[PDB]
């Protein structure tokens, strides 16, 4: 557009909430969010994606097929975003697509990360160039491949004179530390965000999530369970660190609970919420005892989580990223649009102090719509 610099960002989280699609203008000083869209993952594709953890079921062939399917769903998400915003595909510079994570294993001897959602398919079915596959360059340089939001967070949320934490509560929670001086930006996965509280409410209540943490609020934390969960070696690891689904998952949880079979389900729920809150708070208080905390992702909307976090961080002012003018629901999609913009402009996006990569590098691959 006319002094517009339109990018699309596409993110499909590990929690299966859908493909989030954002149309962002980066021509100005702050990102301007133009339009948003969530594309529902159809249940046949949801089941396929779940099967990728079922051994002896032709998982590689299934991966290749679903990579195509996810690509088609990401393109549909783009096209539905264009139908609601009514901006021509030709006005879009590039799509920044995270894809959908299937494996994240940065700490194997030979480290790797695996996102599907074929960027050739997205480019073909949208008519817009695609920048995708952002994590693998960071891994190639010895990094965790994650989090990648911190450089975006520094540019968008940092305030000279203020120590800020940006906390994204997805399946896994990650913090960005923005010290508010010459000092380096930090960031890492603290541990579980919503992944375990979601798994437990799905198991017991067959709801997809615990709305506003109200079920957690009805229960009482078991201190023995909490202490045991918090003793996982992951929480004692130094940053840079990230984790996917290999540590905090249903199988792990079920084995953790195999002495607490007679606990009330709502007490387990409360305890799992506290695992998230306490692991996050502990990490934040190691960076600074006082500051400003800005929350984004699904957990920003959980009022029980937010007040528990408030009680744990009395020296913090606590808000969602809304206070900094960025919708908590859309923050992560915007970051991926920003990642495409960085590529477009030939600029690096990872940070060595964040991921452990040996240097800042240009992230992603470009797939032509032509
Ligand atoms: Cl399938
Ligand atoms: Cl086709
Ligand atoms: Cl990230």
Swiss-Prot record:
UniProt pathway: Amino-sugar metabolism; 1,6-anhydro-N-acetylmuramate degradation; Cell wall biogenesis; peptidoglycan recycling
Binding site for ATP: 13-20
Source species, domain of life: Bacteria
Enzyme category, top tier: transferase
Assigned keywords, A-Z: ATP-binding, Carbohydrate metabolism, Kinase, Nucleotide-binding, Transferase
Record-level GO BP terms: 1,6-anhydro-N-acetyl-beta-muramic acid catabolic process; amino sugar metabolic process; peptidoglycan turnover
Reaction(s) the record says it catalyses: 1,6-anhydro-N-acetyl-beta-muramate + ATP + H2O = N-acetyl-D-muramate 6-phosphate + ADP + H(+)
A molecular function (GO) term: kinase activity
CDD domains per record: ASKHA_NBD_ANMK
UniProt keyword Nucleotide-binding, yes or no: yes
Enzyme Commission code(s) on record: 2.7.1.170
Name of a matching Pfam family: AnmK
Function: Catalyzes the specific phosphorylation of 1,6-anhydro-N-acetylmuramic acid (anhMurNAc) with the simultaneous cleavage of the 1,6-anhydro ring, generating MurNAc-6-P. Is required for the utilization of anhMurNAc either imported from the medium or derived from its own cell wall murein, and thus plays a role in cell wall recycling.
Homology family: Belongs to the anhydro-N-acetylmuramic acid kinase family.
NCBIfam families: PRK09585.1-3 (NF007139), PRK09585.3-2 (NF007148)
Stated name of the protein: Anhydro-N-acetylmuramic acid kinase
Source organism of this protein record: Shewanella oneidensis (strain ATCC 700550 / JCM 31522 / CIP 106686 / LMG 19005 / NCIMB 14063 / MR-1)
Taxonomic lineage from the root: Bacteria, Pseudomonadati, Pseudomonadota, Gammaproteobacteria, Alteromonadales
Primary gene name: anmK
